[PDB]
Amino acid sequence: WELTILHTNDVHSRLEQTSEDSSKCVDASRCMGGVARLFTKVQQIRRAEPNVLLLDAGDQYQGTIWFTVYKGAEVAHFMNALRYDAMALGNHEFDNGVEGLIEPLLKEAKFPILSANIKAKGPLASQISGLYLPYKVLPVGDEVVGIVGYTSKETPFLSNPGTNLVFEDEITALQPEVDKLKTLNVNKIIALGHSGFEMDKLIAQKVRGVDVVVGGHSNTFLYTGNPPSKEVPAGKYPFIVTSDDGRKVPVVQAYAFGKYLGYLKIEFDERGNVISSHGNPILLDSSIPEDPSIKADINKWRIKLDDYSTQELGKTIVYLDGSSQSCRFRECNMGNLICDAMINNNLRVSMCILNGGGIRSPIDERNDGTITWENLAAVLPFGGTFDLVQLKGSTLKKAFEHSVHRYGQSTGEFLQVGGIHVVYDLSRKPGDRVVKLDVLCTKCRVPSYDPLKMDEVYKVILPNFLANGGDGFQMIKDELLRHDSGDQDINVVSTYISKMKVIYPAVEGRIKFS
Amino acid sequence: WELTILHTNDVHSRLEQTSEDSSKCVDASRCMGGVARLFTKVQQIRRAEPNVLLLDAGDQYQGTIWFTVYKGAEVAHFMNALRYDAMALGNHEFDNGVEGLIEPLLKEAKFPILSANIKAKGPLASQISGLYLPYKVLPVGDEVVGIVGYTSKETPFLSNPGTNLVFEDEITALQPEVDKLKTLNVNKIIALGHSGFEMDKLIAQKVRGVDVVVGGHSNTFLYTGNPPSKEVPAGKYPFIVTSDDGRKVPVVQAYAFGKYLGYLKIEFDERGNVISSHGNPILLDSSIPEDPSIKADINKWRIKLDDYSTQELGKTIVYLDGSSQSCRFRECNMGNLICDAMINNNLRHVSMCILNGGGIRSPIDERNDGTITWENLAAVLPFGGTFDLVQLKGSTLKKAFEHSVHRYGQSTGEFLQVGGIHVVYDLSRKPGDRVVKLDVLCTKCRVPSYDPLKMDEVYKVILPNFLANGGDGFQMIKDELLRHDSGDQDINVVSTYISKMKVIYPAVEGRIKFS
Numbered sequence A: 001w002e003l004t005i006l007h008t009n010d011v012h013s014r015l016e017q018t019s020e021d022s023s024k025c026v027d028a029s030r031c032m033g034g035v036a037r038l039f040t041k042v043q044q045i046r047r048a049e050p051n052v053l054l055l056d057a058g059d060q061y062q063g064t065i066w067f068t069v070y071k072g073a074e075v076a077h078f079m080n081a082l083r084y085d086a087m088a089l090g091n092h093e094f095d096n097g098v099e100g101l102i103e104p105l106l107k108e109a110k111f112p113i114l115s116a117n118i119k120a121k122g123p124l125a126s127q128i129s130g131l132y133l134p135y136k137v138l139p140v141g142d143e144v145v146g147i148v149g150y151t152s153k154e155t156p157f158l159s160n161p162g163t164n165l166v167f168e169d170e171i172t173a174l175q176p177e178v179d180k181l182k183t184l185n186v187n188k189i190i191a192l193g194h195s196g197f198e199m200d201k202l203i204a205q206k207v208r209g210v211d212v213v214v215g216g217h218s219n220t221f222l223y224t225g226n227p228p229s230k231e232v233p234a235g236k237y238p239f240i241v242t243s244d245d246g247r248k249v250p251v252v253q254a255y256a257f258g259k260y261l262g263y264l265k266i267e268f269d270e271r272g273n274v275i276s277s278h279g280n281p282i283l284l285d286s287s288i289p290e291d292p293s294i295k296a297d298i299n300k301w302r303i304k305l306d307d308y309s310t311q312e313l314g315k316t317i318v319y320l321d322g323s324s325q326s327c328r329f330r331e332c333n334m335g336n337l338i339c340d341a342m343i344n345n346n347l348r349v350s351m352c353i354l355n356g357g358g359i360r361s362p363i364d365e366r367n368d369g370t371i372t373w374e375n376l377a378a379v380l381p382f383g384g385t386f387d388l389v390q391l392k393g394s395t396l397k398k399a400f401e402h403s404v405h406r407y408g409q410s411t412g413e414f415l416q417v418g419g420i421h422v423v424y425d426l427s428r429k430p431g432d433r434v435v436k437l438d439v440l441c442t443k444c445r446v447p448s449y450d451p452l453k454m455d456e457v458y459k460v461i462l463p464n465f466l467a468n469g470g471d472g473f474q475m476i477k478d479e480l481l482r483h484d485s486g487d488q489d490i491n492v493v494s495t496y497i498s499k500m501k502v503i504y505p506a507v508e509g510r511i512k513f514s
Numbered sequence B: 001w002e003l004t005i006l007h008t009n010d011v012h013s014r015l016e017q018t019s020e021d022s023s024k025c026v027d028a029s030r031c032m033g034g035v036a037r038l039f040t041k042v043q044q045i046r047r048a049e050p051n052v053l054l055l056d057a058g059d060q061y062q063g064t065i066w067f068t069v070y071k072g073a074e075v076a077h078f079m080n081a082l083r084y085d086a087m088a089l090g091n092h093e094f095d096n097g098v099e100g101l102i103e104p105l106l107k108e109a110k111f112p113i114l115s116a117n118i119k120a121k122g123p124l125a126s127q128i129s130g131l132y133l134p135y136k137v138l139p140v141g142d143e144v145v146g147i148v149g150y151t152s153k154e155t156p157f158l159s160n161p162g163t164n165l166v167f168e169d170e171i172t173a174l175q176p177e178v179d180k181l182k183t184l185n186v187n188k189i190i191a192l193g194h195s196g197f198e199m200d201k202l203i204a205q206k207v208r209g210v211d212v213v214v215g216g217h218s219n220t221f222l223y224t225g226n227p228p229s230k231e232v233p234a235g236k237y238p239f240i241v242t243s244d245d246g247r248k249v250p251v252v253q254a255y256a257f258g259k260y261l262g263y264l265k266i267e268f269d270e271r272g273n274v275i276s277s278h279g280n281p282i283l284l285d286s287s288i289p290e291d292p293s294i295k296a297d298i299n300k301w302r303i304k305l306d307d308y309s310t311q312e313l314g315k316t317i318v319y320l321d322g323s324s325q326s327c328r329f330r331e332c333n334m335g336n337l338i339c340d341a342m343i344n345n346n347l348r349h350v351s352m353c354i355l356n357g358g359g360i361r362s363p364i365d366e367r368n369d370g371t372i373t374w375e376n377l378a379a380v381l382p383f384g385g386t387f388d389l390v391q392l393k394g395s396t397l398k399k400a401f402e403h404s405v406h407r408y409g410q411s412t413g414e415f416l417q418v419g420g421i422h423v424v425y426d427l428s429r430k431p432g433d434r435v436v437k438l439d440v441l442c443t444k445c446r447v448p449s450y451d452p453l454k455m456d457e458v459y460k461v462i463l464p465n466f467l468a469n470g471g472d473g474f475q476m477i478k479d480e481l482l483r484h485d486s487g488d489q490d491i492n493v494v495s496t497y498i499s500k501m502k503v504i505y506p507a508v509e510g511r512i513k514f515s
Ligand SMILES: Cc1cccc(-n2nccc2-c2cc(Cl)c3nnn(-c4ccc5cn[nH]c5c4)c3c2)c1
Pocket: A091, A094, A095, A096, A156, A157, A158, A159, A160, A355, A357, A358, A359, A382, A383, A384, A385, A411, A412, A413, A463, A464, A465, A468, A469, A470, A471
């Protein structure tokens, strides 16, 4: 028995087609993704293959003005139009709190929304009762396929799920659900969830009975053969895990931003065991037409977004590299721009720290360099503030150690900086990777870079998200000596752009590796 | 027979008292120098010692709005009021061309103006005939003292002397003059000139008959004992040179900006030979009152300068280190500010800048509520030049950086301040092979980043007009540039940028490093 799994993850409000770097589509002839194009490709597959599931591994929420304005109503509407079979809850589904998940998405989705490791307590349990499920058993032809969901345990430190939701360990929560499905004689099981490639591999290895893992969160690009675009594969597609019960378990992911449609054909035997699997993510480029009906509908919804001040904030003469591949791995010029905008606005303190996880998109310079509120809103969508903090040198050294504690998983804690020169030696044990850390002096008439002192006290401008233990920066929350509330993130950056008129941030050597 | 030599050099338009870093005087109680205070100290010495000479070793011209507005008329007036006995021509006396030297200073000075190594050719020879001299024989009591002048051979690469003036080798030019003085039975000889401490020492060693050398140009601070301020001595005061004809020759210098009055008391025998000498530069601090008559006169002249837009250009929250001790030796934040102002104004793609320490003329203090005015800025950038665009081979650029440190340690002007460049020097290496690392901001990239310079590659650089014209000995820029577009006015580029930024805070970032 053959099953085709079509899968998307981390779409992040890319409802319209985008540039290849997934920023605003300007040169339409080279644009990719969008729901209109995705619908065309899905329909081509559903008409050719009999047993097809369309799955989403979370993080449909947040990324563009579509979400800022429609707050999830666009997600329900277009996922319904595309007829998704199931979606796993991602961390970003909680960005507008539980009330922002329940009302526009859980109540309007015409498909099951899943998460086996999220448990509701207090008065909320009765409200959210049955709105999301641990699993769904779906009929596929004359067969039945069990889909069991999971959401990152880290969501309380990355989003706003509230206090009445408990995030259990994925493996611990999944095992009883898979076991229940086996007693219900459901012999084919897909674990669909949002915890990142490393947890996906662990789930594949340790949850007895899982046949396939469809993930997200890490924006992992997997490919078999020569890749069709700029994304570099982390491994083959599918990635094969050898389980503890001795089975070969395919693990798949499809990058992010709706640029690819994941495609895996699985051959099961009569007893539900995977004989083989093959596929590859499909590049949703210009050669695939945008469905006319979906595109007409997208255009209808776009009208309300066309009200956003098309007025130029200023110009960039350089590519503003706010891509995750850069900003979560190394010094990125968009990170330097925001940290210098933060420092500047405050003076109008010379040290700044900014988590890569909060830099959500690049901005392209080829449109006569024009930066609009729409371009910027995709970079900084969270509506947070840039706050002032007084920190011990030891607290800062610990924050920098945390910044690279699990380097290489495309996690959000990597720090972008201002007034700091940090050198990392990744070959060293986690918690001992910071080999050099120089900071801009304050008790000096002429600023210069001097080695950080553990027993010294520094004034730093950082997002309120980091002062509140976001991205696992518990040491900042627990050890800070002062915390003053600041100005709105996006307004700080637009004003600075309007003041500078022409911007050109560079990669200068603020962050180095040894 | 005893002679006291009082000497100033590199006053650079510091007619008014200044802060200790020789920028605008704000906190008067701690201010130093100025001509009013100098007059009090000179008077105290002239009334105590019978045989006194007051000498200037050049570079009275250029430094503050006093010169911008009065163009040398303030120099003639206040040097005359202080009754200088002689002045040597410095390179800065040529900043307004020969016509700017002749008309306000040579014609109005009530004292001889000297230079034995400057020769006039063409039609100019008849015009300047007798306006400056190779030497002057001055009566001092019942004795006569010969003073022979000299000016840096480098003046054509530093200023505007024109094409009708030839700068000969100092030693070659001085020897016939000293010999002529000996035949005129002038047995006491002072070489007063502007070529820098290293040449002063050479003059003392090799010019037969020179008893004392009084110099300038290198802003050398010499002191015997514990120094009274922040200037660190280069050697004892006087510095003793053992001449080739076996004599002990004192060499003196008195820093710059009118902060100190050089003071050397010499014991000569009957035949004019120095028996001994002793002294020290005198710190012109608050302990010395400003002469009331000179100060009243200074205030009278100040009125015309107040007319200068007292309006705030913007604010600094950091000390703008434009001191020569910094900008000619290492990365200085005033250098980074000007190079970033240059790059910025031009964009409002070129991301590389080079700026000689020689063109940075003063720091700016941040303690006056951070206020930057046109007067503060005019002291930093007084030359009225432009910031121009140049297309250079990597090899040309590597040669410029080698030149920047070819004779490092003499407080010469060729040291380069930078923008969009990270350069590392190893000074232990032979001159012409000191640049050990040179990374530049890419241009053929969407994201700018520092990549190693390539000898066969072509870069676009913003630099002063002066450097593109082979100023400071940068002959390789003039001769090898592939394109040279004229730019915007130096000072306007920097004020506009300050007005745009509102609050500035340049830093020392590691653009220049040593190994
Ligand atoms: C814990 C906390 C405090 C304050 C606010 C929040 N919320 N609530 C709702 C939304 C946010 C929020 C806001 C701001 Cl300013 C962020 N910047 N980065 N980041 C973020 C997001 C997702 C991942 C994934 N890996 N790393 C990440 C970082 C933000 C999340 C949470």
